[PDB]
Design a protein around this ligand. Structure first.
Ligand SMILES: O=P(O)(O)C(O)(Cn1ccnc1)P(=O)(O)O
Ligand SMILES: O=P(O)(O)C(O)(Cn1ccnc1)P(=O)(O)O
Ligand SMILES: C=C(C)CCOP(=O)(O)OP(=O)(O)O
Ligand SMILES: C=C(C)CCOP(=O)(O)OP(=O)(O)O
Ligand SMILES: [Mn+2]
Ligand SMILES: [Mn+2]
Ligand SMILES: [Mn+2]
Ligand SMILES: [Mn+2]
Ligand SMILES: [Mn+2]
Ligand SMILES: [Mn+2]
Lengths: 345, 345
């Protein structure tokens, strides 16, 4: 689980994904575009932490019968993991344009790079569509094919709903702070993050292991939605308080007026003077307004508030994993939480 | 074909599609975004001429055995046509962002609406993903289900390749005029327009009629790519010479430095002085420069050249239809060509 050997095995597949999409004897009349797409893939797909792709393989190895774990079936789980990584890559290209971000994975965001700009918009769609080409190549003769493509379809649609709810934080250049509740927060993160980051890898592992029981899927979902909310709260903490040299990205949530966990908790914790600071300075383009909000988050003790929350929530989620039944391996969920707890990136 | 009653039948399906995507008892925890998505669909999907969707129905009606053309199967063909219209709607949202366009279908481009902006990228992805939900609801039981899903994903990938070749007209803010050949042009149009506009409707009609022979799809493709080249050449002519109140869109190709048909033929026809006018003024945002290029296009006689092309190409394509397999209905291709060329004879 999240070992050097598992990482080597997963990265070994990446060159074959690139070949499948750009050098498989198709589209031989437009090599300018196919060579450029190979670069799109090289830059935007493989330089993250790869937790979703690696989790797809770990889920499969922990769900499948040991006697069925052939080189070929483990490679298929890795290919499914790369299809989740293509989905992630696509989402981040669009997200960085929508959030006016500077850096991603330690480099300038794709849309900012020389002679990219608005080309990043098509590249996002192209990366998304490419995962279905990979699924068709490897899975089209297997019983899991239709469930897998339908799951990717459904998760895409849900992720788009979450990305829209996330974007509705601002109207006419001011944040809708009266609506920044923990209820709204939980709904945003369920849709924009939890389905594609946590539900999708585990459901893919289940499908490849010929596990289709709707009740087993629903019990995995309940715990993976809790893990997803936890994970997004960590992401929100890193936006304001992370070291951008370690996280690889400069935060934008304050300037973009987002209904982040920090904003929700700041509103819960603020006295009336602090609430007026949020009303005046949250979601503004001016660097001085964002620093006023960061200084409010410091004064409120939001770093220590997050640290306590993270520890308390880690323990609650593990209590809930202990209560899982429907024949699901508790250690799969424990390994996912161990990997993310106390992360700084 | 392309009659008022056929339009009535087709249009009646749209409200059912909107209900399927926004008011079918799903995602009941996020009514803010489902209600917004209904508005996205209303603005962006049924506001065109519906040639592609209507053509899907006509293709099915001409390819299926007459004895099998039940109201129910004709309605299925209509649903597939609306899936093509969801793909069109998505592509135009993103295209208008990429092309920095003002109007589409006689209203502001979606991204220009208040509280839209780069959220239009997310709306584009959401509208395309929608069509796969529609396919699952209505077609999941039929032999054609997987081929239809795969055709949509393949056509999306190809269209993305075409959109990227189209975008690579400019480098470092100046057009790559030496590369603006008719060979490059024909490649751009094949990928960015012809597959999704002409091949997709016909191949969908074929699949719904249980026609899986790749040779029948390929015979159709030869004709449909020729019609697609005229359709995109007409679009390019009207970008400079159309009336925006009639076309519903303000042209941008000169300012954007595009490898349009006008640019390609201008470079073929230009004397050295005229080529220097293209070098200095093509692909510039300054309105003087764009008017100087339009004046060059007039001086070169490009309007008459286009009118000759519209007449000659109709007659060349008609001759080519005569040579198609006796196994395909020649009149389907004649009907498509007559509608695109606005001719009864
Ligand atoms: O905070 P976001 O939701 O924008 C983010 O987490 C990306 N994202 C998009 C949807 N779910 C997550 P990132 O901080 O990586 O920019
Ligand atoms: O000229 P474009 O290719 O941008 C266009 O035809 C749209 N489009 C996009 C792909 N194929 C066609 P429109 O003139 O409608 O803006
Ligand atoms: C859902 C979220 C928080 C987006 C970023 O995901 P990661 O932090 O896993 O980013 P990468 O490893 O893929 O770069
Ligand atoms: C491929 C092209 C030329 C894009 C516009 O297509 P239409 O002119 O068919 O657009 P709508 O009817 O859908 O508005
Ligand atoms: Mn972001
Ligand atoms: Mn975001
Ligand atoms: Mn974030
Ligand atoms: Mn355009
Ligand atoms: Mn365009
Ligand atoms: Mn055009």
């Amino acid at each position: 689980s999240f070992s050097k050997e598992e990482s080597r095995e997963f990265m070994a597949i990446f060159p074959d994904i690139v070949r499948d999409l750009t050098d498989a004897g198709r589209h031989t009349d437009i090599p300018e575009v196919t060579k450029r797409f190979a670069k799109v893939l090289q830059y935007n797909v493989p330089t993250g932490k790869k937790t979703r792709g690696l989790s797809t393989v770990i889920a499969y190895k922990m769900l499948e019968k040991p006697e069925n774990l052939t080189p070929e079936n483990v490679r298929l789980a890795g290919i499914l993991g790369w299809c989740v990584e293509l989905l992630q890559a696509s989402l981040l290209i669009m997200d960085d344009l929508m959030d006016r971000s500077e850096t991603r994975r330690g480099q300038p965001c794709w849309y900012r790079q020389e002679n990219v700009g608005f080309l990043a918009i098509n590249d996002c769609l192209h990366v998304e569509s490419s995962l279905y080409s990979v699924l068709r190549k490897y899975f089209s003769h297997l019983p899991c094919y239709v469930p897998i493509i339908e799951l990717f379809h459904d998760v895409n649609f849900k992720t788009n709903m979450g990305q829209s709810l996330d974007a509705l934080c601002m109207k006419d250049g001011r944040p809708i702070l009266s609506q920044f509740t923990m209820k709204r927060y939980s709904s945003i993160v369920k849709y924009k993050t939890s389905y594609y980051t946590f539900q999708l890898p585990v459901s893919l592992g289940m499908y490849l292991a010929d596990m289709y029981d709707p009740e087993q899927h629903r019990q995995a979902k309940t715990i993976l939605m809790e893990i997803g909310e936890f994970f997004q709260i960590q992401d929100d903490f890193l936006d304001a308080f992370g070291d951008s040299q370690v996280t690889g990205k400069v935060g934008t949530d304050i300037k973009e007026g987002k209904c982040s966990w920090l904003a929700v908790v700041a509103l819960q914790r603020s006295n009336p003077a602090q609430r007026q600071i949020m009303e005046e300075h949250y979601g503004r383009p001016e660097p001085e307004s964002t620093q006023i909000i960061k200084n409010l988050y410091i004064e409120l003790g939001l770093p220590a508030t997050f640290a306590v929350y993270e520890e308390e929530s880690f323990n609650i989620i593990r209590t809930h994993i202990h209560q899982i039944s429907k024949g699901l391996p508790h250690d799969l969920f424990f390994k996912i939480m161990k990997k993310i707890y106390k992360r700084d990136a």
